[PDB]
Every structure is written in C-alpha cells, then in structure tokens.
Amino acid sequence: ATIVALKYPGGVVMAGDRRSTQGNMISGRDVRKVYITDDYTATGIAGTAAVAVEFARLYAVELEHYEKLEGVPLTFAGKINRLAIMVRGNLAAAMQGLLALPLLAGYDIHASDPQSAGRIVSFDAAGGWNIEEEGYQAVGSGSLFAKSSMKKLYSQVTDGDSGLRVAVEALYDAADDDSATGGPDLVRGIFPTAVIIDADGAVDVPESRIAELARAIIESRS
Amino acid sequence: ATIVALKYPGGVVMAGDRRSTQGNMISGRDVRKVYITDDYTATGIAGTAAVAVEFARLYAVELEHYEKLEGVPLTFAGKINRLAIMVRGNLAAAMQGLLALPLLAGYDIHASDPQSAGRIVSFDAAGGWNIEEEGYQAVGSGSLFAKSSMKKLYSQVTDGDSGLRVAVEALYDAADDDSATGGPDLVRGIFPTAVIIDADGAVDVPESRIAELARAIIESRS
Amino acid sequence: ATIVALKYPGGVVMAGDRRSTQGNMISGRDVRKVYITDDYTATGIAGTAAVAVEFARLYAVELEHYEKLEGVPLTFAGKINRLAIMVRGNLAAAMQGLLALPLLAGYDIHASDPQSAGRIVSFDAAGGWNIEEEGYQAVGSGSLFAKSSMKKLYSQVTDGDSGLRVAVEALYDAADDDSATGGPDLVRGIFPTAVIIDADGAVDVPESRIAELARAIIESRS
Amino acid sequence: ATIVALKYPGGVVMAGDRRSTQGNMISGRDVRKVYITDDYTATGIAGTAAVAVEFARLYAVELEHYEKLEGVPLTFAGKINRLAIMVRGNLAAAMQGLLALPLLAGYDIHASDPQSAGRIVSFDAAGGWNIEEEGYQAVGSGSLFAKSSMKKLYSQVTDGDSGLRVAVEALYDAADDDSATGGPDLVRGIFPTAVIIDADGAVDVPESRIAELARAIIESRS
Amino acid sequence: ATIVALKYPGGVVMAGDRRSTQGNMISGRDVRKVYITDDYTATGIAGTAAVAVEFARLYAVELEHYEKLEGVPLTFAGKINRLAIMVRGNLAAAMQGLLALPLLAGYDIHASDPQSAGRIVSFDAAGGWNIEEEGYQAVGSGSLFAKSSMKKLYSQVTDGDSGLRVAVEALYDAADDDSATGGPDLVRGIFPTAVIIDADGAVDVPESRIAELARAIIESRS
Amino acid sequence: ATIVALKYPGGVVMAGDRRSTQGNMISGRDVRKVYITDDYTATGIAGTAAVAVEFARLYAVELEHYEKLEGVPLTFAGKINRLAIMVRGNLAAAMQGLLALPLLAGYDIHASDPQSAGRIVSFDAAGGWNIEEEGYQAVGSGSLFAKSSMKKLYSQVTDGDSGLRVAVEALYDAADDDSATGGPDLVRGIFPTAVIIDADGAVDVPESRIAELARAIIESRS
Amino acid sequence: ATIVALKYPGGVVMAGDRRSTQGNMISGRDVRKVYITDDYTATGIAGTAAVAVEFARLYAVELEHYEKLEGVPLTFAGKINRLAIMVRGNLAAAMQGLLALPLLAGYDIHASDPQSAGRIVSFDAAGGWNIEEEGYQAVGSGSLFAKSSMKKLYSQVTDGDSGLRVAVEALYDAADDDSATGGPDLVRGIFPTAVIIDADGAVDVPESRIAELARAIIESRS
Amino acid sequence: ATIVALKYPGGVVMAGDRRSTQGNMISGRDVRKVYITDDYTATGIAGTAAVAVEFARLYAVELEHYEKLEGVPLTFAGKINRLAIMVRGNLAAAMQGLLALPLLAGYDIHASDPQSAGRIVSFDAAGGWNIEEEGYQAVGSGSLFAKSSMKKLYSQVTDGDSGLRVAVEALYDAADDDSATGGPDLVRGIFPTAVIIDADGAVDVPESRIAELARAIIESRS
Amino acid sequence: ATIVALKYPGGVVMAGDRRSTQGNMISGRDVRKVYITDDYTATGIAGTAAVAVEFARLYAVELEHYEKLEGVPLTFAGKINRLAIMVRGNLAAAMQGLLALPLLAGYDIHASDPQSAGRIVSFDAAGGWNIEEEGYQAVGSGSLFAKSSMKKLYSQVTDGDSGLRVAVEALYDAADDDSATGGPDLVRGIFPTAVIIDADGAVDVPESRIAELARAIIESRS
C-alpha cells in the first residue's frame, strides 16, 4: 500500500497503488484506495480496507450533511479539523491493530494566488495533522522510497502531465523497492488510479494516460 | 522462496526462484538456491540463506570426503541418511528460528530401469524423510500453489523440455499467487535457475532456454 | 551511523559518517568508522563502537597472521568466509544488543578484467553474506535513504572522482533524512572520511577533497 | 523540542525550535511551537504535537469565553489555575504516553513596577506549577543544556535585543548538544520563532532579526 | 559523584568531588575518587566505591607488574587497551548494578610536541574507549552540568592555574545543579582533590590552593 | 522536604525547608511549604507539591465556608476531623504515588490554661491522626534526624525565640544529614520560613530573624 | 540489633545490644555480638547470628593462621583487606537474605601518635570499606538514632569512662527509639557488653561498671 | 497491641496496652485502645488505628441513634448483631490490609443472675462472633501469651481487684513475650488503661491503682 | 509435634509427644521423637520424620566414629558444632519443605559444678545455635504454649520427679492448646516418652511413671 501526492502550479495530483495483501499472500490486484469526497478535494487512506472505506464514506457523508444544513461548503481548516477528529476517535482500534492513516489533498478556492492554492495534509496515528509544504508527501508501507524518488524527481514538475509522470514513477520505484506494493500489470492490464484537482474541480484520470506513462517509464528503465 | 522438482522419463529436473526478502522488503533479486553436490544429485534449501549455503557446502564436503576415503561413492540411501542426520542436528536452531528445509533430487545409477531411476526426497523439520512418488514435489512459502499447478500440468510431461516448461510454469504460478516469490524479470533480465540430472550426470540449464520458456509462458498468459 | 560503498570502473570507493549518539544525545563528532585491513580491501562496521573496533582489529590481525604463516595472502573467498564466521560467532551478543554489521569492499587482483575487479560484500545479522552487484550498497541507520540516493545518482559515475562525489552526496542525503547521521560540519571543519581502493592498493582520501566536494554540494543545494 | 523564555527589564521573551522527530527520523523542519493566547501572554508546549495544538486552542478559547462572558480579562492567578487544571486533567493520557508540558510567559498589567511585571511559569506532569524567578526557564528534551547556557549568558541581558540574542544562543547550544533539537537552517532558510511581550502587548518577532542574530552567532562560533 | 578533567598547554589537570550517597542519605563527606596509577597518568572512577577502589588498585598493580617484568613502561595505547579490557570484563556485574565508569588522563612522553602531549580518554559501559579532543571531559551523575560549564569557561585556560580554577568552578556548578554532588565545605574545611600531570610527572595539588580558589569563586558568585 | 513544629509556653512554632527535588536533580530553591489556613492554626504538607498546594487551598476554603455559613469558627476537633477526612479521601492517589502527609499546629482559644493551649497533630497515610504531646514533631524525608535533634535540644526551650532557634537548628541538622533537605543559603540569601502562633493569632516570622539565627548557628558549628 | 563504637584520646571503645528477635517475637535476651579477634582489635557483626558467629570465628582463625605462618601480625590494612574480601564473598547469600554487616574497631601500634592510634572501619553490603574519622560510627537497625545521639554527645568525651558513658547513652537512646533494640534490663540484670582497646591491648569491660552507668542514665532521664 | 478481658463475679474487666508501632519503629507510647460505647458495655479494637477509632465512634453513634429513636436501649444480641455487621462490611478493606478485630465486653442487665451477667464476645475477620465462656479472652499480636497467662492465673480471681491484677499481669507477660506490646513505663509514667463494668455501669480505672499493681508485679518478678 | 526439655539440679530431662499428622488426618499414634545419641546427651527433632530419623542416626554414627578414631569422646562444643553443620547443610531441602529443627540436651562431665552441668541447646533453620539458660526450652508446632506453661510452672522444679511432672504437664497443655499435638491416650494406653540424663548417664523413663503422672494431672484438671 502506497499513496503519493505532489503539488504542481495550478493544481494538485494524487495517486495510489492497487495491491491488497493478507500477510504475505496477495488478496487483491486492482484495489482502489483514492476517493473523491467532494468537488475540490480528494482523500486516500492506507491500512485496513474495512476501516478505510468506512472513513471515506463517513467523511463524504459528513461534508455533504454540513453543506446541506448550512447552505455553504466548509472551509479547508474545518475539513482538516473534522478529519483530525475522525482519526483521533479511532485511536483505541488503531492500538488493537485497526490502523488507518489518511492523506488529504485539496484545492483552496479562497486563496489569493490560484497557482499556489494546492494543499497537502498528512495525519498521524494520534490525530495530529501537518500541512505539507515541501511539494510532495507519501503514505503507506513504501512511503520512504516514494518520498526519496519524489525528492530527486520534483525538479521536473512544471504542469499537470509532469506531476502525473513523477507520481507514476515514484509509485513504480516504491513497488520496485517494496514487496507489499503492486506495480503496473502488463498482463492483466491493471494500472494505478490517479485524481487531478484544479480550479475546475476534481476529476478522475483516464486509465489510458496512466497506461502510456507506465509503459514509457518501463521502456526507459529497460 | 519456492523450489520445485518433478520426474520425467529418463531423468529429473529441479528449479527455484531468485528472491530474498527481509520481512516485507526485497533484499535480493537473483539469489541462487539450487546447488549441485556431486555428479548424480542436486539439492535445494528453502529458508534462511545463512543456514542454506552452509548446509549445501557441508553436504558436498561430506560426500566428497567419504568418496575419497572409501574410494567409492555413497549409495542413495546413505546420502539420504546423511542429509536426514544433518537436518535433525539443527532442530534447536530451527526452533529458535533458523529453519532450513532442503529438497533432494538425484539419479540412481544402480537401478534396474534407467527410465525410472529418478528420485525425489523431501525432508521435514524434525529430520524425517519421505521418497516422493507422485512425480513432483515443491518446497518453500509458495509450495502449495506450485504443487497444485504441477498436479494439473503433469499430464503434459513427456521429456526433459516438457518437464522444464512445467517447472517454469509452476514457478510462475507460485510467484503470481505469493508475494514472497519472485517471478521472471523482463527489465533486469533475471530468470530462475534450473538443473537437469540424467544418465550423463547433472548439468546446469543455460539462461537462454529459461528466458525463452518464460517469455512464451508470459505471452500465452496475456 | 551510515556507511556507503559503490563501484566505479577500475576500483571501488568507501565512505562513512562521523557521528556517535548515545540514545538521543550526541557523544561524538568525528568518529572514524572506515578502516583499512590490508593492501587491497577495507571494511566498515556500523553499530556498537566497542564491538566495531574489536572486529576491525581482530580481522586485520587474523589476515596478517595467515599471510605470515603461509607466505601468501588469502583469497577473496577465504576473507569473506573468515569475516562471515566472525560475524556468526557474535550472534548471542547481537541478540542481547551488541550488534555489529560490517561492510566489506575490496579489489580482486586475481580477476581477468581489471576494470571489473571491484567487489562489495554485505553481511547479515546471522552471518549470511551476499556479493553486491547492483554497483552500490549502504549500511547503517540511514542506509535506505543513501541507497535510494545512489540509485538515482549512479548514472553519473564514470571514474574515481565521480564515485567519490556520488558517495558524499548520498551521505549528505542520509544525514538530511536521518537525525542519527551527522552531516558535514562547516563550523568545526569535520568531514566524512573516504577510502579509495584501486590496482595500486588502498589509500586514504585527503580531507581537502572531501571538504571541497561537500562545499560544492551544499552550494548546489542552496 | 526545546522552548526557552527569559525575563528582561520591561518585558519577557519566548522562543522555541522548529524540529519534529518520529523516533529517530526527522518528520518536520519548521514546526511552530510558540503561540499567542491573548494580548499579554504567550504559551509554548513541548511534547506530542496532537496534544500541544489542542491545548493551545482550548486555552485560548477558554480565556476568550471567560472574557466575553464576564466583560473583564482573567487575572494572572486565574490563568495559571486554569492552565494547571487543564494539565492535571490529562495525567492518564500522559501516563499512557500522550505527554505535553506547557510553558507560560506573560506580562502583568496590574503590577506596581512595570519593569518587573514579566512572569514565567513552569508546569509539572502532575499539574503542579511554580513561578520562575531566576530570570529564565527552558522546557523540552534539551532543556538542561539551554538552562546552563542561559545561566552563563544571563549577565549580558539589558534590553529586548540582548534577551533575544541570549535566547537564540541558548537555542543554538541546545541544538548543538541535542540531536532532537533543530538548529538554524542556512540552506532552507528556517529559523526559530520568537515572541516578545511588553507593556504594549505581545507581538511576533520578524524572521529577519532572528536570521541576522543566528548568522552573527554562527560567525562568532566559527 | 562528578569527576572533571581538561587539557591546558603543557599538561593536564584532573579533579573530582568528595561526596558518597547511599540513595538519598549522605554517607561520606571527604571520599577520594582521584588516584595516581604511575608517574605520568592518573585515573578517576565514578560509581560504586567497592568496584572503584578495586579497579584502581588492580590497574596500578598490572602496570607495575608489566613494568617490572619487561623493564620498560607500557605505551599509552597499551594502557588504554588494558583499561578497556578491565572495563569490558565487568559488564555482567555492571548489568546487575555494580557499574563503574573510569576516566583516564595522562601525559605522553613519546610525543613530538610537549605542549600537546596531554591526553584524556573516556570509557563506556561496554568497554569502548574514545580519546577526548575538545579539551575537556566530565564523568559522573553531574557530568552534563560540568561539561556545559567547561564549554563556556574553556576560553580562559592558558596555564595550570587557569585550568585548575576552571575545573574547580565546573565542579562547583555541578554541585549546585546536582544534589548528589558535594560542593566545597566551609564549615568542616573539606575541598575537592586535584591532580596535575606535566612533563615532570604527576603530583597532588595541596589543599590550600583549592581552598583559596573555592573561596574566591564563592565570593565572586555572591 | 522537612517540616518541624514544637511547643513552647504560650504558643507554638512551625517551620520547614525550601527545597524541591525531582529525583536527584534540584528543581526549586525557595519553595514555600508552610501555610496559614486561618487565624489560630497553620498547616504544613510534605510530599508532592501539586497535591500539597491543593490540600492547603481546599482546607482553607472549607474552613472559611463553614465559618461564613454557621457564623462561628469550627472547634479544633472538627478541624482535625475535616483534615483527617481529606487525607483519607486521597488514599488511592497516595497508593499510586501522589502521597501528601500534612502536619497541623494550632492554638486552642477554648482551653482553661493559655500556657498549654498549643496543639500539634500528625496524620498518617491512611487518615489516622494523633495529638502530639512530647512537645515536638517532624515530618518529611529527614524527619528522623530533626526529631532526634529536637529530642536533645528541647531542654533549652523557654519562650518563642528559644523555640524558633531550636527549630532552625533541627532543620539545619536535618539538612546536614539528608541530601533531599536544603539548608540555609548564604549565597542567594534563602532561609527557611517560620510561622508563630500565639494568643494574638498566627503571624509570619520575618526573614531577618531567621537569617541571624542561621548565621549564629553556622558560626557556632564552625 | 545495634552496635556502636567511638574514638577517645588514647584508645577506642565498642559496645552492642543484647537482643535477638525472630520477626516480631523476642528470641534472645542476652545475645553477645561483640567479639575480640586478637590483641589490638575487636569486631561486631549485626544481622543473622548464624552468619555473624561464623564470620567472627573465621576472621580470628585466619588472623591467627597468618600470624603463626609468617611469625608477625598482619598490618591494619591487611586486616581490612581480609575482612573486605570475606564480606564480598558472601554477597549472593546476602542477596538471598543472609546479610551480615560487620564493624571493625582497632588500635594501630605502628602509628606516630599514640593518642590518635584508634581506628574505626565500616563495611558495606558489597564489600566496600571506609575508615571512620568523625569519631563515631554505629551499625544495625537502630544505627541512625545512635549516630544522632553520639553526634550530640561527642563533645563530652575526654577519656575512657566518658566514651563508655556516651556509648551506653547512645545504646539506650537507640533502644528507646527502636523496638528491635533491647535496652538495659533491671529485672533480669542484663546489660550491654563493651570492649575497650588501648595501648595495653583489648579487654572486656566488667558488667558492674556498665550496670552503674545504665542506672545513672536511667535515674537522670527520670 | 494486646487487649485482654476476663470475667469476675459481679462484673467484667477490660484492659489494653499503650503501644503503636509502624513496622519495627515505635510511633506511640500512650495510645488508648479501650473505649466506652454506652453505660453497660465497652469495646476494644486491635489493628489499624485509623479504622479502630472510626469503628468505635460509629458503633457509639449507632447505639445512641437507636436509643434516641426507639426510646429504649438495644438488647445485647442486637448490639452483637450490629457489631458483627459492621465488622463484616469491612472485609474487602481487611483483605487489602486495613484489618481491625474488635473485642466486646458488657454487662447484661436483663439476666436472672446478676453475678453471672458479664459477657465477653470475640469477633473474627469474616464477621463471625462467639460468646466467650472460659472466663477470659485476649486479642492482638500477643494474644496467645496473655491467654496462656490468664489460663494459669484465673484460679485467683475472686473480685474486681483480683481480676484487675490478673489482667495487668497478663498484659505484662504479653509485653515481655512480644516486642510489639508495650509494658509499663517507669520513666515516663505510662501505664495501661482499664475499664470496669458492673451493675452500676462502666467506669474508668484511675491510673494510680494500675500504677501500684504494675509496681507490685515488677517487684514480685524481681 | 512438641518436644520439651528443662533443667533441674543435677541433671536434665527431655520429653516429646507421640503424634504424626499428614495435613489434618492422623497417621501415627505412638511415634517416637526422642533418641539417645550416646551416654551423656539425647536429641529430639521436630518436623519431617524421614529427615528426623536420618539426622538422629547420622549424628549418632558420626559421634561413634569420632570416638572410635580418636579414642576420646568429643567435647560438648564439638558436638554442638557438628550438629550445627549438619543442620546448615540441609537449608536447601528445608527451603523446599523438608524442614527439621532438632533440640539438644546433654550433661557436661567436664564442668566444675555437677549441679549446673546440664545444658540445653536450640537450633535455628539457618544453622544458628544458642545455649538455653532460662532453664527450659520447647520446639515444635505447640512450642509457645508449652513454653508459657513451663514459664509458670518452673518454680516447682526441685529434683528429677518435679522436672518430669512439669514436662508432662507442659506437654499436656500444648496438646490441649494445639490440634497437631497428641495428648495422653487413656484408651490405647499411649503416653509420651521421656529421657533423663544425669551424672550416671542417659536412661529411658519407664512408661509406668509417665502413666501415673498423666493420670494424676488429668485427675487434678478435672
């Protein structure tokens, strides 16, 4: 399990792997771990799937409920506070073993500079949150390898396509260096899913672009 | 870690994977686990590498020492007894965690029927040994998947090439179903190693044949 | 504690940090961890210093004793076997907490190709050894960060100076990403020590070259 | 984590480091640990960030709520009592491992002598509080080194700039003597944050002054 | 218990406190912890007295025995090795609770520069040794406070008297900041003992000089 | 921590030390441990400060509340019962480690003989109370030494000044024999605080008298 | 169990109680705990009687054996070393519960000043020894009370009778303050035993003198 | 702690010691343990004082409350039932260590024979009660010795004075045979307290009679 | 199990009960526990019978062996030392549960006064021994009751018959007060065994005298 997210001028990208493992045996091959909560942010949870899907659904439901009740969407700080409270409320279950660490990436429509409106937030096991400002952040088992790869590869990010390519390459490096992370599948045609958030909203990247990027990266590495 | 061995008319084949993992992180990519002790048998040990290489070297040294002292090679039963004693003498270290389960495949030159002279022997953690007679046997973490694949694929074994193809396909299935087993590497050009033992002795299969077999299997599975 | 070693055409380089920490408090600022055993190989041990210096001295003494007794130096395989036996004999003390993982880099004078005569060997806690062939290897607390940095930076290695620069940059990255690794000191003038082994023997890199390389890297990163 | 605070004629200064470490790996590089609750006092919490930010926000909210309800600000003794109750109410979580030790520095507008109106209060893990009167106090992992440095350097404090320089030098010494404390960053341009409280209220020290002070201290130490 | 030692041009000084405490109750008031082994070095052990006196006597006896047997005194490296072996041989008793950490200070008569012939060696609990080169080192319960005081006060060391004054001031600071360290006694006339080693040998500082230095320091601090 | 109290004809005196220690390190140098609850009695608590200040404040608040509600002050037996109930209600926290043993000294205005109206009450950890009648009582870590000193020195008590001198001498002896008790400070000018209760009420002894008494005692002991 | 010993001009006295208690029940009423080893020293052991008598007999036997073998008595330092070795050799039994702490008092015939030839040595549980120089020392359960009493009463010691009276008074105070120490028995006529060592040798004090001293002390205390 | 009670024609006597011990150290010298609940019975509790005084006060309060509510005193069986319920309700605290075993002695005014109206009741730790009919009963640490002494001495009981003398002698024997029981004090003038209950009610024995009885017993034993 | 022994002018008597109990069930009714080792002393062991008989036989064998080897009987001190060594050598088995506490009574033929030549020695579980001088001593489960009875009844001992009667009465009292001690049996005719030692040697008391004494005591108690 590895989820990466980096900031590019005018938006933010988010991607994750598609592998679920029960110990050392592979259980899933195309598991989806990146979800869209509402128009201008997406979340990704690494850990137990049973807690991850529940957290995603509950976060989306709470955001929609508040928006319907008050008539206006929550501010970014309010969303961060709600997610932090949700994470903190599961500390006992995390101690038992039901651990889920989410990653939040969104676009701030109430920012003076649209080019620097992208935000990346990481959460701790105890509920603490920190706003990422180095331009990238990764979570999961292979987070360290992906973070090092992004540290070296962030100099080539200029637009959305460059950021997507860097994210795919970081995921490939994490899968190469970690046995719990699943790389691109050229036999079954399974590729990581990505979400791009910009001023127009959050959209889902088509599988064709990710397939071409993965094929190009594999050819280059050969 | 997965090592497979099956019997074909006129000989016996033996193959294993090339992956070493320290927990969940990949440490090796072309680790060799199949060794040739003397002319008419080869061994393969799955488990801790530090114990596996030591066991292989010690077994070869003991066989050579006996052959030099007495002037004649040991019988197959004597070799099985020596290997069983060696395995039994390491039970305390196996209990602590230094476990090594070897697999023995050899050719009996003192058999009435040369076509049925192949032998496969499996060893337990307590030193018990059993002569395999179903025609195939696998050891390691992904032994069950490989054994099922060989159970379905043993009907197509007629000669050495068919047995080698079946072994490679079983290793591929085990790597597909197990995250601790490494499949063929089309980027770095790493392929499993195989040893063929027949009436002329034990030889090492060239990497080119294994590469072509793996490529054909991958193309067929696509 | 971080020690790195990579292979370049015609030799091999080896370097390590200069930090000793007692828990979370800094105890040493210029600790030397890379030692020269004899003419054509050098070793580096990461872990408890009391065991590291003892292991280095004992290995050098054993090599010199064998060379004096037999009149010829040991082969590389013999040196690897001796070091593996020494590491394996300390497993109980390592279990208690006195752990020391050495890294071996040397030059093989009995190789057909002088340009590919460099060797890098890594040792496990149980005494297992593996010959490194990816071109680089790192040990210590910050080994992962240095290994990722070398994975990205190995494409620029052409000669000794390039390899030394890559090693220094990898050490700098490891110190940046790890609080237990000490980076270059521009106030006290403390810089990591490096050893270069080639066909002419093993020599110690002067501090001036490492100082200039570290200053250039710091200026580039600014 | 290290937070220092000392008293100068006519006010009080407060500063802290910008390092967050998850065990031995660095997680944050510009973490803010000094916060302003209201006009005439500021607080600093060392320990778990998830508890520290919550404590700061809750203390500020409680003070504002009381001021709005009663129409007058709380006395200094009342603020100390409220903070002590808040600290005491978290003793079980501190026993489990969620420990947070705050440091309180403020200006008493109801004092006969304005020059001696500065107050420094330290809190224990059990909720006990003591008013600091030696002129300085430090909390965190590297509190001892900073306290010794301030013990030697307090003789040069005459005004606000002298106190700020002494605080920065004490933080530098603590970072030098402790691996968990982050010193000034000349590459990324990260410097410790400081807050100055005087008769006109609590203000935030601009980063430029701290940068010049740190550069001067580094040059002097060279 | 606190023992300090610092280097001055042309020699080395060594001093320690005179307090023995059984838990929280004071048992001794003039305990001697600095001993002279032979002509050109002195040792000081902090910890259990029953082990400290035994270690001092055994070290002196071993040095004298070697000098009598071989006719020449041991080199400094040999003395360090012997002391390290002695410390390492007591690791089990230290684990039970009989811990003794010695501090070694000596003068090297076989050095090119007489002004830089002073040496300070510190030993770890596991037997590891490191040659001190910052110019000072302290051991005992209040070692940190004394080390910080010496860090600030080392700039005034020019000769033997300055070094002695700095050592006495550091001991006074350690006694002030630590309840297990005994300061100067103006009622019973008990003062710390000091040993000065120079090119002429190791001598014992008379109590009168230490008394005057302590009185001057107390008057200055008033 | 040591608090002493003895009876003299016409009143009662009470005094305590000014040292707070966190294990073996000194944390406070002028901590106040003797408090005045109301007109005709004072209390002193030895142990955890966080519990001691809370107990003193709560006892004073309860006494004032009862006096305001009923219009008449509580009898001495009622005050003893209230304090015993308060002590008994904290037995679980004392078992965990939050132990606080108070000492009560007061003047009974409803006694037939004004000269024998002084009362001293000691409390146990389980809430039991006993009225002291030997003429003196001490509590704290160094209670035994102070009690022995008062046993020898009680023959010289004739009036208030004699009792104060005896109490100061007992505190000095306790500080001499105990490392957790702080004696008079001739450098920082810190002296123990004392409270005198007589027929006119409870008053605080000025620091000048205690300073002169301590100086005279120190001169006599020299 | 309480044994006291103090120094007077021209000799040294030693005395102990006569009570043995099995838990809380009295088992003995006239147990002797002070023994004479040879001419110029006597010893007293507090703790388990079965170990105490054995230690006394063994010490006397060893001293006599050495004197007979070498023809000259051991020096005082040699006797101290032998007793320390004997105490150290029983550390395991002391840990189990068979603890015996001896007290050594003797006269040095090889001293320049006969008036200051008295010596008092105390031993720790780990075998450490310290020469007493305050003029008095007590061991046993009620050692603290006796030591405080001697601290106050040492000013009246001028000769042997004064020292004996002070020792008897200290024993009486220890018995008064400790329930495990037996005071003088006026019904059965049991009184503590004392030994006086001077330039003429060690002699046993007659019971009549101790009886008169105890009666006078009891009458004075009435 | 020892409390004795025996029956004589026409009444019943009750007495107890005056010693309180905290482990092995004496804490009290004239502690009162025999109390009068109402006109025709008295109680004595041995064990923790904090529980003993509380039990005595609560029993007296309950008896007075019932007498005031119903207008008639409780029967003896009702009093026994109430005391048994009170003892049974404290079983958990007794299990923790807060054990208190009371002894009840009273006079039955509703009995046919006034000469045999005395009653002695003993209570167990579980709340069980038994009416004593052998003529005597003792409780406390030294209960066995006192019971044996009363077994031998009960033949001389004819009236109140004889019973009082027998009780005092039994207490003296218990104090002689037990170190936790305090005998008569001829120095401080402390003697055991006794209560005599007859047809006229319960009265307190004056100290003079007990003093004369103790002096006569001591003289006889001499 | 109860064994008693008391001293009378001109000799010493020794007696014990005849009951063996396995927990709470009676196993033996006439078990003999008093044995004669040699002419002038007898021993009695209380505890495990399997150890008691072995100890008696071994002690007798050792005494006879020494007497035969040297030609003269051992002194009383030598016998005490041998018995103490034998008891001390069984401390581990006693800790497991095989406890045996012997009682020694003998006649000293080498004493100046024949009337005071009787000796009684008691031994502890750790091997310590004490010579009894109060005139009586008892061991076993009911030792306390017998000792109290002898304390009251020792005033009537004038000769052998009086001592025997006192011993029988003490045994009867111990059996009455203890359920593990067997009293005289008037149905089966079982009575305690006694041994009388005087100047003429040790003899066994006939059962008729003990029967008459027990019958007289029973009649008197009726």
Author numbering:
A (entry chain O), B (entry chain P), C (entry chain Q), D (entry chain b), E (entry chain R), F (entry chain a), ...: 1 to 222
Reproduce text from the manuscript describing this model:
Stacked β-rings enclose the degradation chamber where active sites containing the catalytic triad of βT1, βD17, and βK33 proteolyze substrates.
Frames 1 and 20 represent the most distinct states in the continuum. The comparison between the initial and final frames clearly illustrates the transition from a disordered state to a well-ordered conformation that closely mirrors with the canonical resting state of the switch helices. Inspection of sequential frames highlights the progressive conformational changes of switch helix I and the decreasing flexibility of switch helix II that accompany the resting to auto-inhibited transition. Switch helix I significantly rearranges and moves towards switch helix II. Concurrently, residues 92-98 of switch helix II show increasing order, with their density becoming well-defined by frame 20, explaining the slower deuterium uptake of peptide β87-98.
